[PDB]
Amino acid sequence: TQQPIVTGTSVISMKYDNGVIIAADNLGSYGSLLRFNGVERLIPVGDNTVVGISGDISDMQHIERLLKDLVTENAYDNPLADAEEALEPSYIFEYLATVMYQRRSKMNPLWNAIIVAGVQSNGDQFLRYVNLLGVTYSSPTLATGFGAHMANPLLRKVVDRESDIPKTTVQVAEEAIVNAMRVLYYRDARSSRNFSLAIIDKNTGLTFKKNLQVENMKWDFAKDIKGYGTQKI
Amino acid sequence: GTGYDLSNSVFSPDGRNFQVEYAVKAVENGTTSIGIKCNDGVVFAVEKLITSKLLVPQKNVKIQVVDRHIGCVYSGLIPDGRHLVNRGREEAASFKKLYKTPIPIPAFADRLGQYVQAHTLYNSVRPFGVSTIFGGVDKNG
């Protein structure tokens, strides 16, 4: 891909005491046109990993196909594919990251930003980031695009350091994620009110919620805004 | 004349490829494996000869899986069966990548059959030493 066409916007994610949470809207934008509504950008792999992708929707679907093929190939000749030899989040990440860096170095990158979030077999919370440049980093809060500028400042006030992770509950993290989605719908032109939210908890497993909407919006004060300065009526 | 069994793909005066029949003899020397088609699917079964108690039970899996819906069990030379299963998995992956839908069971059958028939076409390749019972459930049952 040399320039993206149909693109998805920000993807936010953060850790908490017993797992991780990720979320992203369901919008596919043809530039300035909100062309496709209801476009799932959260790909659940197994019962312990979720991949959130932003960028070219075609490359996102290519990565979906790659993940499905990776699951199928790991199932081959593996009697423990549902157990000790299942696909871990770190495996899926490392694979995607190798792919992204290779595609960058071949001057034909996957125009995407990917966030892999899940729980390892030993209960550890995995949350890492990659992009079309192949740059990888891991932080208690990860966002792409406008989220990286707006979602992270809100989510980092809950977990500014690793030591804050054991103190955060699932309700706190989910409320923060919903607030960040609302703020993005406020201040992102390429955003949507409908989104999806996944919770990978080391005890309850994968909880995937679709068709969510941004609620509790403050718009009443818009009635008191009249004119761009000196106008009174 | 003589020597019609020394080279693969060479037809005998009767019209037979003796190397193929020798491979069949090699197949008959293997353990027993069966397949039964029920009303909504298929069931495969295989015997694993326990050469010694040193073998780990429930390990040394003999039945292989292709895609997520095809099962294959082969009687004869186990390495040849694994090679054929790998080739079939490649064919199924190609079929899915190109047509989205999972490969139909008859299409997979024809792919494996053309692969084997090609392996019985040249004197530089040895015919497969396995008989394979496979199948599964597709959109046509």
Read off the CATH number of the domain in which A126 is found: 3.60.20.10
Task: Work out how many domains chain A is built from and give that number.
Answer: 1
Tell me, yes or no, if A169 is annotated catalytic: no
d(CA A199, CA A176): 13
Q: Note whether A160 contacts B: Cβ–Cβ < 8 A.
A: no
φ/ψ of residue A177, rounded to 5:
-65, -45
Which residue in A72, A79, A25 sits closest to A46, CA to CA?
A72
Helix locations, B47-101, DSSP H: 78-99
Contact A10, A148 (CB under 8 A): yes
d(CA A90, CA A83): 16
The greatest distance separating any two alpha carbons of chain B, rounded to the nearest whole angstrom, comes to 53
Contact A34, A189 (CB under 8 A): no
A79 → chain B, closest CA residue:
B61
Q: Are strands A141-143 and A11-15 parallel, antiparallel or unpaired?
A: antiparallel
Interface contacts (A, B; CB < 8 Å): 16
d(CA A196, CA A211): 6
Contact B76, B26 (CB under 8 A): yes
Which residue in A127, A97, A114 sits closest to A10, CA to CA?
A114
Partner-chain contact B65 A76, CB within 8 Å:
yes
B98 → chain A, closest CA residue:
A65
d(CA A200, CA A83): 17
Q: Angle at the Cα of B111 (from B110 to B115), degrees rounded to 5?
A: 115
User: Rounded to 10 degrees, what is the CA torsion of A77, A66, A89, A203?
Assistant: -80
Structure determination method: X-ray
Contact A92, A82 (CB under 8 A): no
**Range list of β-strands (E), B3-93:** 33-37, 42-46, 64-66, 70-76
Closest-CA distance, B98 to chain A, in angstroms, reads: 11
Which residue in A41, A91, A53 sits closest to A71, CA to CA?
A91
Q: Note whether A75 contacts B: Cβ–Cβ < 8 A.
A: yes
A212 three-class SS? strand
Q: Note whether B100 contacts A: Cβ–Cβ < 8 A.
A: no
Closest-CA distance, A99 to chain B, in angstroms, reads: 18
Partner-chain contact B68 A72, CB within 8 Å:
yes
Which residue range is the domain that position A171 belongs to? 1-233
Contact A48, A119 (CB under 8 A): yes
Contact A51, A67 (CB under 8 A): yes
How many CB atoms lie under 10 A from the CB of residue A81? 17
d(CA A7, CA A56): 5
Which tokens go with A30?
């043809």
What does R_g of chain B's alpha carbons equal in angstroms?
A: 17
Which tokens go with A209?
């919620």
Candidate from A65, A69, A75 with C-beta closest to B65? A75
Candidate from B64, B65, B93 with C-beta closest to A69? B93
Measured on CA atoms in the order A156, A162, A166, A167, is the torsion positive or negative? negative
Which tokens go with B41?
């699917």
Listed resolution, Å: 3.4
Contact B76, B54 (CB under 8 A): no
Which residue in A123, A126, A122, A182 sits closest to A150, CA to CA?
A182
Set of chain A residues whose Cβ sits within 8 Å of the Cβ of B64: 76-77
Q: Note whether B33 contacts A: Cβ–Cβ < 8 A.
A: no
Which residue in B98, B99, B95 sits closest to B70, CA to CA?
B95
What are the percentages of helix, strand and coil residues in chain B, rounded to 5?
Answer: 35, 20, 45
Cα distances (angstroms) measured from residue B53 to each of A53, A171, B17, B31, B33: 51, 54, 41, 18, 22
Which tokens go with B10?
């060479």
Q: How many helices (H) and strands (E) does chain B have?
A: 3, 5
Contact B130, B62 (CB under 8 A): no
Q: Which residues of B are catalytic?
A: 31
Q: Say which of A1, A72, A98, A144 is annotated catalytic.
A: A1
Set of chain B residues whose Cβ sits within 8 Å of the Cβ of A81: none
d(CA B55, CA B53): 5
Closest-CA distance, B16 to chain A, in angstroms, reads: 36
Set of chain B residues whose Cβ sits within 8 Å of the Cβ of A77: 61, 64-65
Contact A27, A9 (CB under 8 A): yes
Helix locations, chain A, DSSP H: 57-75, 89-105, 146-156, 170-187
Contact A181, A25 (CB under 8 A): yes
d(CA A23, CA A180): 10
Q: Angle at the Cα of B26 (from B20 to B29), degrees rounded to 5?
A: 150
**Range list of β-strands (E), chain B:** 33-37, 42-46, 64-66, 70-76, 130-136
B54 three-class SS? coil
User: Rounded to 10 degrees, what is the CA torsion of A50, A56, A58, A62?
Assistant: -40
How many CB atoms lie under 10 A from the CB of residue A223? 7
d(CA B78, CA B131): 10
B82 → chain A, closest CA residue:
A77
Measured on CA atoms in the order B54, B57, B62, B67, is the torsion positive or negative? negative
φ/ψ of residue B56, rounded to 5:
-75, 120
Region of A191 on the Ramachandran plot (φ > 0 left; ψ -120 to 50 alpha; else beta): beta
B107 three-class SS? helix
d(CA A114, CA A142): 10
d(CA A154, CA A143): 11
d(CA B52, CA A126): 44
